[PDB]
Design a protein around this ligand. Sequence first.
Ligand SMILES: CNC(=O)c1cc(C(=O)c2c(Cl)cccc2Cl)c[nH]1
Length: 319
Amino acid sequence: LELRLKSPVGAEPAVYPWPLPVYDKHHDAAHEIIETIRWVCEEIPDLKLAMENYVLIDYDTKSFESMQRLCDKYNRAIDSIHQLWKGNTRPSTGLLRHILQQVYNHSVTDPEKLNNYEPFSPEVYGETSFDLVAQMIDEIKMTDDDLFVDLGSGVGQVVLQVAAATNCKHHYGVEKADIPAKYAETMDREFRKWMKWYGKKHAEYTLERGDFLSEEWRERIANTSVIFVNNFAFGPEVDHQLKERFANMKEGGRIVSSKPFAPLNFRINSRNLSDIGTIMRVVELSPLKGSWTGKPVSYYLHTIDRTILENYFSSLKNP
Ligand SMILES: CNC(=O)c1cc(C(=O)c2c(Cl)cccc2Cl)c[nH]1
């Protein structure tokens, strides 16, 4: 016993076993099936016209016959549309939210294994992070000349969201811990498969297991144009090593973080010449000021700017 959903672009069908998988106490693969059908109908007008929409109103998620009828009605409407078309774009924000959740649900089957009790972690990515990352994407406006890196990428959710939305040359995720890095391999596979099923384009990306403080990563950070780092729980020792890596970045290089690497009110003088604040601008970006009705959250945008240090020396030489 199984349920099948035909791809709107002729990719291999999505195949679900029966009884349907349960994700948590209030979420299961039946709600995922209904929402997938609704998303494909909303974005394919001819499909909405062909589909007998009443089947999406009256259904029983606990009945194999009811769920099979619903899947069959959708599969028949897909077939009618493929017949009509007989005779790749980026996903919308709404579809991407659905895809990322679906990818997670098919990949992270045992979330307890993550041993993650933090507020902005993989298990709660959809609550605020998705919206804040979307706001960040609209704010930094990356181009094909950019290289994006997430330092401590978890199961790779930020990398997948950014790669689906932007045209950076490449997106990298580096994760040290065993369990999220192993789950990132499944997230990668499921993301490519589902994006192909929907017929959606994404930029190139790589999720890798590694230590972002290693020698190999020193040159890699130096060549990165956009660093994303949720450093809130890192503490001052790792934060110190990161500032050393950031100090080799190019002019205009950017760092997006959850805790600033330099004070927001940094004032260069003879006693703090050694501080990272001498070579980077720092601003707090808050969607509540940047409408937003979510949590009162912020991120920090750092921009490599060695003219801060240069102006201090020029002012001493020309008082
Ligand atoms: C206690 N942690 C926080 O307040 C916090 C975590 C984060 C993020 O991980 C993040 C960033 Cl850095 C940039 C854009 C989007 C997101 Cl979700 C932001 N603030």
